[PDB]
Write a protein that binds this ligand. Structure first.
Ligand SMILES: Cc1cc2nc3c(=O)[nH]c(=O)nc-3n(C[C@H](O)[C@H](O)[C@H](O)COP(=O)(O)OP(=O)(O)OC[C@H]3O[C@@H](n4cnc5c(N)ncnc54)[C@H](O)[C@@H]3O)c2cc1C
Ligand SMILES: Cc1cc2nc3c(=O)[nH]c(=O)nc-3n(C[C@H](O)[C@H](O)[C@H](O)COP(=O)(O)OP(=O)(O)OC[C@H]3O[C@@H](n4cnc5c(N)ncnc54)[C@H](O)[C@@H]3O)c2cc1C
Ligand SMILES: CC(=O)CSCCS(=O)(=O)O
Ligand SMILES: CC(=O)CSCCS(=O)(=O)O
Lengths: 522, 522
């Protein structure tokens, strides 16, 4: 069943409703056909996948005046982020931060008693499921009515050759193909991995039909594992993380990483490094009852009825690589040159499909650049020197070099941080700003107010790296990184206008030291 | 009683304790004398006041190799901000934001029933009083041990002439004086203004010995009035704001202002424009019982036992002007040229003492620029095109021109905002990020997820203004403003690396429109 929506103009909320209906449809739902029947031009590019990369790539290509076509197996545009990736992740992280606050000040002011309070994980996941069609509605609307895009949703794409694709029972031709099918959840090849009670970011928001027990086991040690792990811990459950190597290796500054790990442990999280799951035990009904793993100190068994796999995402290259004969990398990523061109003529690859970094900025930009190249604008794209972030119970932002990294690299440096290095350590009222004021003023909670630092080259006076743990600096790192790439110095940072009290105190702290020709750490 | 602390080296926490002791000492406390009695150099400048302007100016002067002396009547450095201004303001705004969240989701998830819950204002003020010495301790420690500053605290400065100052019973000479005594609370010339129950930012944290009733009257529409007003409202009290002119004029963009005001009213706040208090009624016990004011709709009477004055701060220029013969402005501000020089030879004026804008960046920067001039470096300072912000129950950030302002300036423009202007209005799941996810997904709460907009010149493609209501963008505005002053275009904005989900969605949204030669609003 195909629905020609081309001449239909549903509102954001109407789209939200129609999408929900199609998703919960037993037959699978009708195909959303939004194609221009009067355009004589041949598609400059057909996007296989309409997620972050595909949608943005199409938006830009269309803006340039070219013709595009999106084909996605989901009845909505936007991809994984709004359905099971970044959006739910941020809802969960919001809860983790709010819950850490409530537990810290339990039984104080307007804060209820959290002593034996266990928050429902399913209730929050259900909250997400109940409102995720909202964002999906905005995407279908914005893409059609505002971005003037053509698309076919709720129907998998069928790639015949580098110029032909079958969709909605029809066959389409294009000058180029832009592969943007993203990546899928990583898994384990251990007994019990298919048991009821084992989840990943994708299945968690589709198959959680019970409320997890008191203990949760998380497998992995990077972003996803830590973000979801802190949320589970925040709901009041004993959370054990089994990390194959070492956790949070993305945090290069040693002190910053230590602060983050220390605060996670203070919240009760257990992180076991060098551990490898060997078996997920099933009970008589096929449900998880425990996790067995090998560690540096021997085998261990953790009783649990809920296991979350937070492993790296894997590029969905298999099918396309076989159909087109694409050259692949060691992790299955599709190989491409600086112009996003694969080994197959007129075939580009973007987003998570081409590997790391697997972030939205990389997906959207690669999608746009591939589009520009398809339109004749030869432009290279090699992601490098970008800001990054992750959530624990705090927002953790970082860019550039860590302190030890800079000194080992041959850079004479000075650092400016908060709190200062003294015998009182973290037990002081700074750093402090929006969302950390209660920690800064509470009895025995000052050490929880945050940690931040900038690394500066003592000779060039340029900022080499910035690190922040707390809240409200993430957005700033987007803009600060650009200034740093321009050659930002401690003097220029000190000359800015701060908005006190600020999440990052970099501006004024730089000003305190910038008056000297021979910089000194603070 | 003078304590020579020069060769003593207290830790941050020992300083916190010592300062508290001196502040609570019945006799007034001992003088804190930190002077290098062995240094034979003349003082380049004596700073009258060691607040934001005096402390930063001293730090910069010392960094440049000059010699300085700070004299302050309080036993700590840092001024009003940590004792009764910005720091408590932020603790209160943090509470206001958390309380709106709790009230919005009352009885939902882990949130307790807030239906009939009135938070204790005195409890929060007491929390502030109990922990404010922490920041004070850091300031005394940082200034002495890290910034190598000389200072005399807990002693009023007694200026003799433009080169001589008395402090701690000793007479000091200097090449220049830098006046940095700030400003004091503004008051009303009406009957009953001195009744018990009438407070300003300063007296609120020193004399609140009772818990306010169910109604609070706030006089003024300034940032402070609005910030404290929303906090009082958040505690569960009927809050009436008596604004002299138009509410929130600082927010130039009409749409942004409307959103902010509408959200305040949704929380139950009553905002009265063009109102002037005529009398504060006292009961037989000498306590405020009602406020009477004239408004565009006639005289009104509001019963209350707690009134908060959020009027403009007044420069502390009287005594210094009499002694030195300083030229003053109509509001009592000390007049200075662009080098921060007063009408008196070798005497500079900085911070709130020289008038608006009364902000920390202005205080600190003016202090440093005066210091540089004292050290022989001719440098002018004229605050202009700076970012700004204020708190309601949300963080409100703004810079540059509002939409209407831009068109009146002759610019042909386009705008990029969230949420989109459609039939569904604000009732959609965008904008969304950290701390707005629950609002975005909650039943009927989507409209509370925020509002944001950038104003762009259609021809030059340059960003002319940025506006945001939500959380986590404040810090970013510090850096974004610098980029905008450099001539940021929509294309350059789109070329940045975003950190999704981001408080400001400006980067990716700009990218969605940047591909066209003829820009169209989103
Ligand atoms: C738990 C989690 C949290 C994350 N948090 C963040 C974060 O905070 N910030 C950030 O920047 N990044 C985050 N990411 C990563 C980010 O989600 C991805 O990098 C980005 O979504 C990838 O976009 P893409 O366009 O390459 O793929 P996707 O957006 O995943 O979309 C691929 C699209 O192709 C479609 N498709 C697949 N196969 C076919 C087929 N055969 N036929 C038709 N359509 C097909 C899909 O249905 C989908 O719409 C997170 C990821 C995870 C897993
Ligand atoms: C309620 C409130 C909230 C605010 N919130 C913000 C905000 O969020 N962000 C922002 O940027 N700005 C904010 N401000 C404004 C900011 O507090 C001021 O602009 C800044 O503190 C002024 O610094 P200053 O150095 O000029 O004066 P101050 O820092 O106030 O210090 C003047 C100093 O001089 C001393 N002094 C006075 N008389 C004498 C004397 N005779 N002898 C010796 N010492 C003397 C004082 O004891 C004091 O230490 C706020 C103000 C108020 C009132
Ligand atoms: C409304 C929504 O889907 C938020 S998740 C971002 C999807 S996209 O703009 O990167 O396609
Ligand atoms: C620690 C503290 O006082 C925070 S308030 C800022 C005071 S100053 O650095 O502007 O002097």
């Amino acid at each position: 069943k195909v629905w020609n929506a081309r001449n239909d103009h549903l509102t954001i909320n109407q789209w939200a409703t129609r999408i929900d209906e199609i998703l919960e449809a037993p037959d699978g739902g009708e195909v959303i056909y939004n194609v221009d029947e009067n355009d004589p031009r041949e598609y400059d590019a057909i996007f296989i996948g309409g997620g972050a990369a595909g949608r943005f790539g199409s938006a830009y290509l269309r803006a340039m005046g070219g013709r595009q076509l999106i084909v996605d197996r989901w009845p909505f545009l936007g991809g994984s982020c709004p359905h099971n990736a970044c959006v739910p992740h941020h809802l969960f992280s919001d809860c983790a931060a709010e819950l850490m606050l409530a537990r810290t000040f339990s039984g104080q002011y307007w804060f209820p008693d959290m002593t034996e309070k266990v928050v429902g994980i399913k209730e929050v996941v259900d909250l997400f499921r109940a409102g995720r069609n909202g964002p999906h509605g905005i995407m279908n609307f914005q893409s059609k009515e505002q971005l003037n895009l053509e698309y076919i949703l709720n129907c998998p794409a069928k790639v015949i050759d580098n110029h032909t694709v079958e969709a909605a029972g029809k066959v389409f031709k294009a000058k180029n193909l832009i592969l943007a099918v993203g990546a899928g959840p990583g898994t384990l090849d251990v007994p019990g991995v298919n048991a009821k009670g084992v989840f990943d970011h994708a299945t968690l928001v589709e198959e959680l039909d019970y409320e997890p027990g008191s203990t949760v086991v998380v497998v992995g040690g990077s972003k996803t594992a830590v973000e979801y792990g802190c949320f589970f811990n925040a709901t009041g459950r004993r959370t054990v993380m089994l990390v194959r190597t070492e956790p949070l290796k993305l945090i290069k500054d040693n002190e910053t990483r230590a602060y983050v790990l220390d605060r996670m442990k203070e919240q009760g999280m257990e992180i076991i490094s060098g551990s490898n799951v060997t078996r997920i035990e099933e009970d008589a009904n096929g449900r998880v009852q425990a996790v067995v793993a090998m560690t540096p100190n021997g085998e261990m068994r953790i009783e649990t009825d809920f296991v979350f796999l937070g492993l790296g995402e894997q590029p969905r290259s298999a099918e396309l690589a076989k159909i087109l004969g694409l050259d692949l990398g060691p992790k299955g990523e599709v190989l491409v040159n600086e112009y996003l061109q694969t080994s197959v003529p007129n075939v580009y690859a973007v987003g998570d499909l081409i590997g790391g970094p697997m972030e939205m900025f990389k997906a959207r930009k690669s999608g746009c650049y591939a589009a520009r190249n398809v339109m004749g604008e030869k432009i290279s794209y090699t992601p490098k020197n970008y800001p990054d972030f992750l959530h624990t119970h705090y927002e953790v932002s970082f860019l550039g070099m860590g302190e030890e990294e800079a000194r080992a690299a041959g850079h004479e440096i000075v650092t400016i941080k908060m709190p200062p290095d003294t015998e009182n350590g973290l037990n002081v009222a700074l750093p402090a700003s929006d969302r950390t004021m209660l920690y800064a003023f509470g009895k025995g909670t000052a050490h929880m107010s945050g940690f931040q630092k900038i690394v500066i080259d003592a000779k060039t006076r340029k900022v080499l790296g910035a690190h922040h743990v707390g809240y409200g600096a993430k957005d700033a790192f987007q803009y600060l990184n650009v200034l740093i790439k321009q050659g930002l110095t401690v003097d220029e940072l000190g000359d800015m206008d701060e908005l006190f009290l600020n999440p990052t105190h970099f501006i004024q702290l730089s000003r305190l030291r910038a008056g000297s020709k021979n910089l000194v750490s603070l």
